[PDB]
Design a protein around this ligand. Structure first.
Ligand SMILES: OCC1(Nc2ncnc3[nH]ccc23)CC1
Ligand SMILES: [Cl-]
Length: 167
């Protein structure tokens, strides 16, 4: 039993809700919130800009030190950093950016990072400003993630279409 509330069960391990991931994080304080990161951990907009703003820019400050030490992430890769006031940990995951021509096949690799954590609050990777088909992102999630994932989907109209086309 966990404290996630109001989610629709899609499969044995995947759940979904029409909500801002930032608000779900503020309410649940999950062990792991997933950020839809880019390789530079520049948290400007979308999920990343919203999470970072909610941390009063502490996420960005921590991220800049991470990059200065370690260099950029790989597309499809991830790192674990602090969750600040939103969660215990933030798993920064880089899905491919279709607008930059990055290989959508890397979306599966991106979701594989979720399997290192038993329970996660996550957005749809590569959706929104990242330019991929969100229906496809949900399919890859369900077919790749084996741990328990709670998907917060900000856009109401998007949430409605994701549910209806699933089974
Ligand atoms: O609409 C779904 C998507 N975006 C978001 N999802 C969850 N929480 C969010 N907070 C800000 C943006 C945002 C993935 C594209
Ligand atoms: Cl977005």
């Amino acid at each position: 039993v966990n404290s996630f509330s109001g989610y629709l069960k899609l499969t044995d391990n995947v759940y979904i809700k029409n909500a801002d991931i930032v608000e779900e994080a503020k309410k649940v304080k999950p062990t792991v919130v997933v950020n839809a990161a880019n390789v530079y951990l520049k948290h400007g907009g979308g999920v990343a800009g919203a999470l970072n703003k909610a941390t009063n820019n502490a996420m960005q400050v921590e991220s800049d030190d991470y990059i200065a030490t370690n260099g950029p992430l790989k597309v499809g890769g991830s790192c674990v950093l602090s969750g600040h006031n939103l969660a215990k940990h933030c798993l920064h995951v880089v899905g491919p950016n279709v607008n930059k021509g990055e290989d959508i096949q890397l979306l599966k690799s991106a979701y594989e990072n979720f399997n290192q954590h038993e329970v996660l609050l996550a957005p749809l990777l590569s959706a929104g400003i990242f330019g991929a088909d969100p229906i496809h992102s949900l399919r890859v999630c369900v077919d790749t993630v084996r741990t328990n994932v709670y998907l917060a989907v900000f856009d109401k109209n998007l949430y409605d279409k994701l549910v209806s086309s699933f089974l």
